[PDB]
Amino acid sequence: MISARAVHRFLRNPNLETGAAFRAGTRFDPFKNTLTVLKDPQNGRTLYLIGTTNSSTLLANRTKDLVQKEKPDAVFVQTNKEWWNLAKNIQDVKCQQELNRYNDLLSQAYTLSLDNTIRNLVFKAKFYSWLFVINWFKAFPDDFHPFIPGLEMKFAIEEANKQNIPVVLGGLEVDDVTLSALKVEPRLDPFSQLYYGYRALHNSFWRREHFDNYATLDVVGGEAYAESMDRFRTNWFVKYFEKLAPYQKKIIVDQKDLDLFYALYRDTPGKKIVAVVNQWHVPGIENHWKSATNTHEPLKAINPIGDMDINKYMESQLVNDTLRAFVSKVGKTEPATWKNYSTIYHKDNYEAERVRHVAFVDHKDPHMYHGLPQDYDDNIKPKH
Amino acid sequence: LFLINNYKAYKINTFFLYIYIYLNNLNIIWYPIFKAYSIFGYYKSTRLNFIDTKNENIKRIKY
Amino acid sequence: FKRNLQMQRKVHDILQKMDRPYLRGVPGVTKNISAGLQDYSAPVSKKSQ
């Protein structure tokens, strides 16, 4: 029943020995790291899942053109009513920098409908402290705000309104549903979050990856970094979130991926959907959609020793055994090493531990002379 | 920025900037190579990233 | 040079015609699997010479 395909994999080409102009892959690949086409042949439905980082003007224009020309039967935008009101009252803005100028005003859309009781006040204090710590660990600049919707969402909603097609607002990253989910989990604590976030990069790999990721963010801007965020980088970011806060990652990524899949699969008009969601929900939504509609790419079975050339090893062993027998017969002696090629791991060059291979259990053992030149004929024939 | 642009064409401000620029480029220092290898040895020390992209390093078996 | 060339020809002739018992073994234990040799990587550029 359960299709256990890989969802969040960031390790690209671990079988290549890459480096020095032989890269493991291209991460720029614009217009393809963002748009995914999914199909539901059972109902004949088509979904255009657009994963936006809310930071690039080029991707916003591409999304606007896609909504204009595709003419979907429904548009699913991951915003809310407050943000939509604020953004629709903003006009004559056509570049992402101008909209970044309104980042605080659009961030006012993060409204929490919580009570003023003692428990809710304590929760608000804990949640705000945890948000401050997790933003310290996230460390994104002003021009790269993946969780504050920008021009892509606004263009999608406006083009949906022009065509008079219904618009379904899925809420921001932290909405009432996710706020209640975080309320259920009592694992929010700023100090424990600091301690666990300074222990997330437990080996050098993560550290190095971390560095270069943010290094690029410091060199190229938000617009140039949004284009160069592929599936592998997105999966690395979701896994970094999981290492920082596994419980809040489960609440914010996995559960919201399932909720968005529910909304896109059942709570929608259908037969053509354009869904502009955040970048890091695309893997989960796509995996769920493919599993439910059985539209997974065909399985190519991977034999663990499929890339192992056992014939090479056996041929080398046979060749070196024949060469040892031949040279020993020529020189009227026996082999000195029984190791095909000399390497310093056994220290047999200067210590007393030989690599001689002569094993038998009695005087009648047929395999007594295996490995010795006596095993071969004068024609260097393997037997007798 | 508007004020700074407004006082860009003034001769006194330009004179101060000119003095600043002149003092900036006044002290240009030369750092020689004092090892016996000199220029060619240093140049050969800076060839690591480009050795593998050369014809003599192409896999070319005699037999 | 001449004698070494003759000896090398002799040795190569010995190695070409020698019996290879590993070709009669179990695939995946003493032989390549029945499918063959596979590459599971996804290269993005030509490997250097």
Binding site: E315 | - | F1, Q8, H12, Q16
Partner: peptide, 17 residues
């Protein structure tokens, strides 16, 4: 296999030095 035999036999070819 005959193809593998051909390849491995081609591995040991003395050049006309």
């Amino acid at each position: 296999d005959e193809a593998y035999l051909n390849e491995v036999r081609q591995r040991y070819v003395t050049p006309d030095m």
